[PDB]
Amino acid sequence: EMILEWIYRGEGGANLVLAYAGSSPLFVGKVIRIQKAVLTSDEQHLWRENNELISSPNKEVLEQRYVQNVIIPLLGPKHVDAGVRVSVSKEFLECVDKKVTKQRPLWRVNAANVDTSHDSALILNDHSLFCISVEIKPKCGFLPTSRFIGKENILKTSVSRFKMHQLLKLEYIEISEESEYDPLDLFSGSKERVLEAIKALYSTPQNNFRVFLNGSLILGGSTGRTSPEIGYAFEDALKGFIQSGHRTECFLQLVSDAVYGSGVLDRLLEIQKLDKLDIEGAIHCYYDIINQPCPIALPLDESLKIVKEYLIAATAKDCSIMISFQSQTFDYKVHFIDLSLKPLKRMESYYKLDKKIISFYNRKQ
Numbered sequence: 001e002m003i004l005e006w007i008y009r010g011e012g013g014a015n016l017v018l019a020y021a022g023s024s025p026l027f028v029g030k031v032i033r034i035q036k037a038v039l040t041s042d043e044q045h046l047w048r049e050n051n052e053l054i055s056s057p058n059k060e061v062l063e064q065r066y067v068q069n070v071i072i073p074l075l076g077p078k079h080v081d082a083g084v085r086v087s088v089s090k091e092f093l094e095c096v097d098k099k100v101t102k103q104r105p106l107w108r109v110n111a112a113n114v115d116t117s118h119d120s121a122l123i124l125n126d127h128s129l130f131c132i133s134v135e136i137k138p139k140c141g142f143l144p145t146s147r148f149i150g151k152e153n154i155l156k157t158s159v160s161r162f163k164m165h166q167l168l169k170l171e172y173i174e175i176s177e178e179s180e181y182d183p184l185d186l187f188s189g190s191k192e193r194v195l196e197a198i199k200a201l202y203s204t205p206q207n208n209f210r211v212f213l214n215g216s217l218i219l220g221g222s223t224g225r226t227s228p229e230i231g232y233a234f235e236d237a238l239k240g241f242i243q244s245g246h247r248t249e250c251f252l253q254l255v256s257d258a259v260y261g262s263g264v265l266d267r268l269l270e271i272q273k274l275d276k277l278d279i280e281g282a283i284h285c286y287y288d289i290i291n292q293p294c295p296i297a298l299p300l301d302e303s304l305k306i307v308k309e310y311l312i313a314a315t316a317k318d319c320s321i322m323i324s325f326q327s328q329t330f331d332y333k334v335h336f337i338d339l340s341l342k343p344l345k346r347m348e349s350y351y352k353l354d355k356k357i358i359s360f361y362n363r364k365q
């Protein structure tokens with residue numbers, strides 16, 4: 001309740017996120033997440049064990065309810081925050097939709113603008129405040145086993161989706177350079193491997209690693225490999241916060257610690273592991289679910305449970321982490337961001353891309 005009649009921050013393949021540059025208290029220490037560009041009969045039934053959710057008139061209530069009633073059950077309220085729907089004037093959105101641009105990338109602006117056809121939107125806490133913030137999009141930290149992975153593709157079990165992906169990514173000139181990062185070290189649950197992988201991240205950040213100083217981006221994009229001058233540049237900007245060219249071994253170590261310590265990565269890999277069958281498997285259920293033939297036996301309910309659980313792992317595989325630091329002794333909050341319910345149609349796309357990735361990496365040999 002209130003209706004609206006804000007400075008650029010970030011943007012994934014869904015929302016614009018802007019920060020609050022004003023003096024109002026309900027809005028201070030907040031950020032507003034805006035949509036770019038309300039359930040299929042099949043979605044309603046997949047998510048039907050929660051009526052409030054399946055009843056939703058628009059996404060804002062939807063994500064909000066999803067996160068609160070589907071996810072928070074799984075991750076606890078500590079690192080999660082459901083969001084606050086909030087009214088908006090269509091004219092508001094157009095106004096912003098120009099205040100944007102600029103910092104805005106291009107291959108991105110291309111695909112999507114702001115959805116001027118919502119009058120709703122999400123307000124969230126600005127985990128870049130309380131300061132040095134890290135955001136990790138870890139991606140998937142495990143390997144499959146599922147007896148539904150073809151024989152032809154026996155690498156899906158020995159080489160991570162992320163790693164196989166970088167290759168293709170490359171062929172398509174998304175990234176100029178293979179990433180060092182191995183989501184396995186990170187989800188490996190050991191202090192030693194955590195740090196390996198966060199150095200990996202610093203090293204070549206891409207769209208996984210990002211650092212924020214009083215809300216201001218000082219490392220990260222996605223990006224190409226950290227050229228040594230950016231090193232001194234970044235190590236420079238550190239001068240102050242950290243008492244120590246060592247401020248940057250120490251800082252990574254400081255991240256290593258909070259990530260491993262909070263053990264937030266574990267209470268995550270579990271949800272990611274809800275993908276019990278892998279898309280090669282789960283795709284068959286999807287078609288039965290929707291009423292068509294698996295162009296690639298269990299009761300309707302088990303199939304549904306399966307596709308459903310897949311989509312929740314799917315949420316957890318595409319989320320990001322935020323770690324904040326203050327005051328050597330430091331404070332820190334870890335929070336999850338980007339915990340969206342995935343469209344049921346993505347099942348065809350999920351499988352599409354998987355097919356393509358495993359097929360390309362299989363060639364490479």
Ligand SMILES: Nc1ncnc2c1ncn2[C@@H]1O[C@H](COP(=O)(O)OP(=O)(O)O)[C@@H](O)[C@H]1O
Nearest residue numbers: 010011012013014015017124125126127337338
């Ligand atoms: N709660 C938050 N606090 C501070 N910054 C955020 C928050 N949520 C998102 N951001 C920034 O905005 C970016 C885009 O937000 P995100 O929710 O990931 O959008 P998308 O779903 O389009 O990826 C994030 O990667 C992060 O850098």
Ligand SMILES: [Mg+2]
Nearest residue numbers: 012013320338
């Ligand atoms: Mg994102």
